[PDB]
Amino acid sequence: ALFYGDRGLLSGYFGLGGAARSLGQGLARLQTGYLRVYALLFVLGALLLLGVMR
Amino acid sequence: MSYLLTSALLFALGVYGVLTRRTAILVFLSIELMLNAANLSLVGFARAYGLDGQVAALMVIAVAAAEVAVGLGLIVAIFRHRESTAVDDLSELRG
Amino acid sequence: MSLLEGLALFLLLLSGVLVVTLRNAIHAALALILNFLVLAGVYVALDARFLGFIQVIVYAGAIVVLFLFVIMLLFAAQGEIGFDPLVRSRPLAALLALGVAGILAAGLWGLDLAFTQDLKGGLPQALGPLLYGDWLFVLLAVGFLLMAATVVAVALVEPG
Amino acid sequence: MAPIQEYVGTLIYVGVALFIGVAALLVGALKRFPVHFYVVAMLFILFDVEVAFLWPYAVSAGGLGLYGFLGVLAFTLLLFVGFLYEWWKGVM
Amino acid sequence: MTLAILAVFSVALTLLGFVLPPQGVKRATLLGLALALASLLLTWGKPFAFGPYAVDGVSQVFTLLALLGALWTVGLVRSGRFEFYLLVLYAALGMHLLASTRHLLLMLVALEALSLPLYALATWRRGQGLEAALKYFLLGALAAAFFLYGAALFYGATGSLVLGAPGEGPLYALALGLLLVGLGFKAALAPFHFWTPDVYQGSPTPVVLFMATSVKAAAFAALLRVAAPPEALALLVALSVVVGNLAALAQKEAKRLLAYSSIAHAGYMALALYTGNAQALGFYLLTYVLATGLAFAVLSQISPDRVPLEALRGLYRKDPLLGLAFLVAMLSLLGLPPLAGFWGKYLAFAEAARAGAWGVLVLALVTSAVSAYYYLGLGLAVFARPEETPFRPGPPWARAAVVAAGVLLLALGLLPGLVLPALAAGG
Numbered sequence: 112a113l114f115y116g117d118r119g120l121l122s123g124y125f126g127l128g129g130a131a132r133s134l135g136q137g138l139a140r141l142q143t144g145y146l147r148v149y150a151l152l153f154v155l156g157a158l159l160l161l162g163v164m165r
Numbered sequence: 166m167s168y169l170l171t172s173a174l175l176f177a178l179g180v181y182g183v184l185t186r187r188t189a190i191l192v193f194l195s196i197e198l199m200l201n202a203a204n205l206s207l208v209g210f211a212r213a214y215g216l217d218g219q220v221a222a223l224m225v226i227a228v229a230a231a232e233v234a235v236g237l238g239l240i241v242a243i244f245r246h247r248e249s250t251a252v253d254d255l256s257e258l259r260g
Numbered sequence: 261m262s263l264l265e266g267l268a269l270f271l272l273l274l275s276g277v278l279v280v281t282l283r284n285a286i287h288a289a290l291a292l293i294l295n296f297l298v299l300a301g302v303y304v305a306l307d308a309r310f311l312g313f314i315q316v317i318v319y320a321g322a323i324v325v326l327f328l329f330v331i332m333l334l335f336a337a338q339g340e341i342g343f344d345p346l347v348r349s350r351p352l353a354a355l356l357a358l359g360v361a362g363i364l365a366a367g368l369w370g371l372d373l374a375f376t377q378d379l380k381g382g383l384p385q386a387l388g389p390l391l392y393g394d395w396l397f398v399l400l401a402v403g404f405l406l407m408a409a410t411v412v413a414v415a416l417v418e419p420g
Numbered sequence: 421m422a423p424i425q426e427y428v429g430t431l432i433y434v435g436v437a438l439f440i441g442v443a444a445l446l447v448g449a450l451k452r453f454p455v456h457f458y459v460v461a462m463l464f465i466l467f468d469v470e471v472a473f474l475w476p477y478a479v480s481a482g483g484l485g486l487y488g489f490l491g492v493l494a495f496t497l498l499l500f501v502g503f504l505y506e507w508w509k510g511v512m
Numbered sequence: 513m514t515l516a517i518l519a520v521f522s523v524a525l526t527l528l529g530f531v532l533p534p535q536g537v538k539r540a541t542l543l544g545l546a547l548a549l550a551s552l553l554l555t556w557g558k559p560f561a562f563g564p565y566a567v568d569g570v571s572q573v574f575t576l577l578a579l580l581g582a583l584w585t586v587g588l589v590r591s592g593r594f595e596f597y598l599l600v601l602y603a604a605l606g607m608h609l610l611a612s613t614r615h616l617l618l619m620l621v622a623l624e625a626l627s628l629p630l631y632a633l634a635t636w637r638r639g640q641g642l643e644a645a646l647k648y649f650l651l652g653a654l655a656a657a658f659f660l661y662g663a664a665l666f667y668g669a670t671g672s673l674v675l676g677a678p679g680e681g682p683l684y685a686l687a688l689g690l691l692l693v694g695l696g697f698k699a700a701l702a703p704f705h706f707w708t709p710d711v712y713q714g715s716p717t718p719v720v721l722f723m724a725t726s727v728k729a730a731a732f733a734a735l736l737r738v739a740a741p742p743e744a745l746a747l748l749v750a751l752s753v754v755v756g757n758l759a760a761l762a763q764k765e766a767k768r769l770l771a772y773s774s775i776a777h778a779g780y781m782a783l784a785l786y787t788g789n790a791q792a793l794g795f796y797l798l799t800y801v802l803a804t805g806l807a808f809a810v811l812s813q814i815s816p817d818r819v820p821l822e823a824l825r826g827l828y829r830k831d832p833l834l835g836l837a838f839l840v841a842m843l844s845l846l847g848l849p850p851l852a853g854f855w856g857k858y859l860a861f862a863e864a865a866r867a868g869a870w871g872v873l874v875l876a877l878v879t880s881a882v883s884a885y886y887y888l889g890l891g892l893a894v895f896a897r898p899e900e901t902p903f904r905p906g907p908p909w910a911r912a913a914v915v916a917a918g919v920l921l922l923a924l925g926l927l928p929g930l931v932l933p934a935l936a937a938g939g
């Protein structure tokens with residue numbers, strides 16, 4: 112029982128792995144290849160950094 | 166002072182241009198307007214701080230020209246035989 | 261002051277609005293030349309005179325002429341047709357533009373400056389000694405930039 | 421240098437000229453495509469720049485002495501290395 | 513003067529290349545870059561201040577690295593169009609200027625000076641290369657605009673266009689942010705990083721080497737000169753680190769994964785900015801330029817246009833020393849002892865913690881541990897069974913290059929007390 116349980120624990124850690132995988136290919140999916148998108152995300156970003164400082 | 170605010174408004178307008186414009190040359194144009202907003206601000210502040218900002222703005226104009234040469238050169242080069250200049254036609258490189 | 265100024269700045273903002281709005285590349289660029297004209301006006305009014313004349317000559321006269329030659333030598337105003345619109349973007353572009361406006365307005369508020377300088381109407385007689393002087397390094401560097409720029413642009417075309 | 425009045429005068433002059441233009445109009449009522457014409461247009465937008473720098477020198481020049489002259493000389497020679505390039509490259 | 517060598521060689525070679533064969537011009541640009549570099553080594557600890565131009569420790573180290581990138585990138589590009597070396601000289605000088613002033617406007621001129629010829633170098637004329645050039649150029653010019661408006665606002669909030677000017681309240685901050693936009697873009701910090709993957713994947717590989725090393729170097733040199741505030745610094749860091757490694761996980765192509773890797777690495781480097789130590793940053797970038805330069809030379813010997821990760825596999829059998837040097841590079845980029853990369857990362861982290869930026873620091877460390885996924889997925893992949901993969905086994909040039917530069921890595925992993933004593937003022 113506890114053996115297979117432990118197998119499930121390791122499995123869950125792998126689950127975290129896949130969580131980082133998922134989030135990762137989500138952040139890489141942000142780059143469509145479309146330049147207008149890049150400009151939008153850019154201006155947005157600038158607004159963000161500017162919003163943080165003063 | 167009254168001018169400085171117009172400079173900021175213009176820069177904003179240019180940003181709107183870049184974000185809105187569908188074709189390469191016109192995005193580039195909106196950028197040129199932004200540059201000019203910057204220049205105007207440089208003139209106002211030169212009038213506050215004493216004339217160095219004018220030389221600054223002139224250098225700026227020169228630079229702008231250089232990057233217009235290279236930028237249009239590029240636009241023409243890439244889209245010469247190629248069809249419509251809409252910048253989203255190149256989406257091959259994806260993240 | 262304010263009498264002319266209101267009309268001038270309104271015409272400025274209007275011109276810019278056009279250059280970012282018009283769907284005809286020729287018309288747009290043209291509106292931008294109107295902008296540069298009025299801008300050289302404002303420079304003159306701002307004791308930057310030589311800069312104003314260079315504004316007409318280089319920016320209005322030359323640069324947007326290259327733009328026009330190019331949009332005419334490919335195709336202008338008929339390039340935007342495609343209809344891959346992204347109109348969910350238009351209010352987002354508009355909003356982000358308003359944001360980038362608001363932030364600058366904020367940073368510019370509460371600024372009490374002496375705009376009273378003796379900057380004797382931007383004449384090149386007063387501009388020169390600075391340029392070939394304290395600015396000579398930046399000047400020359402700019403020159404080099406222009407050289408490299410032309411070599412790039414030519415090599416960036418070069419058929420065969 | 422100049423009284424500000426004469427810029428206003430310039431503008432007025434422009435006004436008259438334009439009005440007359442309108443008048444005359446109303447009497448009218450009575451591959452490789454870019455390359456050459458691009459290159460020799462771009463070089464215009466570069467020489468305009470060059471001259472835009474040469475003018476401030478040409479006025480205050482003797483005041484700037486041999487080192488000022490040396491500066492304008494260096495500048496000119498750089499840009500002319502550029503032009504000599506696109507000339508020796510050929511434009512046709 | 514280094515600037516003298518660069519200027520002379522550039523202007524001369526422009527017209528001399530009409531009377532010289534392309535190969536002879538390569539010999540030329542090589543010699544010139546080398547001479548600039550040598551002039552640098554001979555004046556180590558000179559500080560030579562002219563006008564806005566100023567050669568101190570920062571200019572020295574960062575233009576040393578940038579010149580090293582120019583040297584290596586020129587080495588690999590036999591392809592005859594003398595401009596495809598000339599432009600590299602142009603860019604090189606420009607990067608030097610960029611690292612050599614606090615003058616905002618000269619800085620702008622230098623930025624255009626280096627980034628204008630690069631838009632051109634993104635052209636192996638590949639349809640993807642053209643896309644890269646276009647993206648790089650548009651996003652670049654916009655960033656330029658922001659940096660210029662920042663300079664005008666800096667001149668707004670203070671009478672100068674020189675960094676080091678005392679600095680006001682709000683307008684000063686807004687100015688610094690608007691500068692950090694353009695400068696950050698140029699160093700591939702988030703959220704100004706979008707161009708990097710497309711450009712690295714799209715551009716011809718040796719060109720990409722030149723970019724990911726020299727450009728980043730000069731960019732950070734110029735970032736040291738800015739008074740970068742803690743808040744903005746934190747933002748840039750956290751975003752760059754996270755997006756860097758996490759997005760790097762999803763990458764199935766080599767160059768693009770390395771671009772994302774460079775985004776995360778910019779993130780780590782920015783930590784040094786917290787104190788603006790510059791001794792740390794210098795070291796870090798020494799290790800980085802070495803290992804990255806190596807990696808991209810190796811990735812050049814496979815394919816210039818694009819490389820899938822499978823191509824890396826079996827590299828050891830083919831060339832043992834390139835396999836080993838590539839592994840070593842991957843480990844030094846991981847920051848795993850006893851390699852110089854670990855010392856660089858440690859030296860940046862050290863400044864982060866010294867500055868008291870703990871949450872940011874820890875975050876960086878966690879996702880840095882994450883990064884061990886992909887750095888190993890390459891270095892180890894060296895030993896896998898070879899898929900049918902393109903390989904031009906290099907000249908003595910490149911083999912001895914990758915090997916020597918590689919040996920340097922663990923050489924400084926064991927003995928950082930060699931180079932670290934003076935990456936400072938030069939004593």
Ligand SMILES: CCCCCCCCCCCO[C@@H]1O[C@H](CO)[C@@H](O[C@H]2O[C@H](CO)[C@@H](O)[C@H](O)[C@H]2O)[C@H](O)[C@H]1O
Pocket residue numbers: 393394395396397398400401404498519520523561562563564
């Ligand atoms: C082709 C390649 C082109 C690359 C760029 C090469 C340019 C080199 C030309 C240098 C001349 O540029 C000019 O030099 C002098 C001294 O150095 C500067 O003078 C300035 O620096 C000195 C020394 O700190 C100060 O005494 C002086 O008060 C100040 O005005 C001047 O501001 C600058 O504008």
